[PDB]
Amino acid sequence: HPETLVKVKDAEDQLGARVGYIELDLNSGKILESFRPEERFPMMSTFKVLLCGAVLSRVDAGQEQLGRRIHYSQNDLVEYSPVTEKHLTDGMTVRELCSAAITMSDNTAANLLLTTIGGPKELTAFLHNMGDHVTRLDRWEPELNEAIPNDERDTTMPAAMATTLRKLLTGELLTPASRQQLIDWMEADKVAGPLLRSALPAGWFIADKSGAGERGSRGIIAALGPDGKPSRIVVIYTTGSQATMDERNRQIAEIGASLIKHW
């Protein structure tokens, strides 16, 4: 509803920053509302949903096992690795690493998973193959969050991200099981409080992933709906703001509040 665009434009004014926005009908795939749909934004940790989709695609084809233990060392640990830093000595299974990447935004877990699938180049190929011709990963954690102005590396567009998220959670790309497994990881999201979850009415469904990066970058991708079922996808990205994290979160939460009000 264009009332939601009011809030998006408000966020732009408040943040001194570009904001990209998509509301997409999950069933039909029709873009319901949009703001900068074909502009590039850094994905930040929102890429970890696509990463784990690529992992599950391999699991589906017999090339990977969720139960396979991955070993790693102190050499592998990057900034913000709450789960992996605990299991250095034990290693972690592919399953546990996707859980950690998605639910905890664990950077090292994402790096380890990237390695199993062939790096950002194969994540990009995967995405291209599934019909996303703009989304690209080029770097690894933590460099991918750099959000250099006019840098196309590690970017998506809101429209492509929305469409990709729909294909992953509800298309024929993944098996019904892998879909549900991706959704499960996203539904247990433990760091995405302040954005869309904070505005979601009791009884509603949400499977989300958020990101934050340098240069004020912040974003979230979500499948959500009432009566405990997802019926729409929301994509919100922003970059360039000098606003505090709390200030950015509040702006993103207000857009959330509006799309719910105008559901």
- The helix-strand sequence is HEEEHEEHHHEHHEEEH
* Structure summary, number of beta strands: 9
Which strand order does the major sheet show? Answer: 2-1-9-8-7
Radius of gyration in whole Å, from Cα? 17 Å
CATH fold node name: Beta-lactamase
Percent of sequence in beta strands = 15-25%
Count of alpha/pi helices: 8
CATH architecture: 3-Layer(aba) Sandwich
Main beta sheet: 5 strands, antiparallel
- Multimeric state: monomer
CATH superfamily: DD-peptidase/beta-lactamase superfamily
Number of domains: 1
Enzyme class: hydrolase
Disulfide bonds: 52-98
GO molecular function: beta-lactamase activity
Organism: Escherichia coli
Describe the structure in your own words.
- The chain has 263 residues and is an alpha+beta fold.
- It has one domain (1-263): DD-peptidase/beta-lactamase superfamily (Beta-lactamase, 3-Layer(aba) Sandwich).
- It has eight helices and nine strands.
- It has helices at residues 2-15, 47-60, 94-103, 107-117, 119-129, 158-170, 176-187, 245-261; strands at residues 18-25, 31-35, 41-42, 69-70, 92-93, 155-156, 205-212, 218-225, 232-239.
- Strands 2-1-9-8-7 form a five-stranded antiparallel β-sheet, with helices on both faces.
- Strand 1 and strand 2 form a beta hairpin.
- It is globular and about 50 Å long.
- The N and C termini lie close together (8 Å).
- InterPro entries: Beta-lactam/transpept-like (IPR012338), Beta-lactam_cat (IPR045155), Beta-lactam_class-A (IPR000871), Beta-lactam_class-A_AS (IPR023650).
- GO terms for molecular function: beta-lactamase activity.
- Substrate binds at residues 209-211.
- Belongs to the class-A beta-lactamase family.
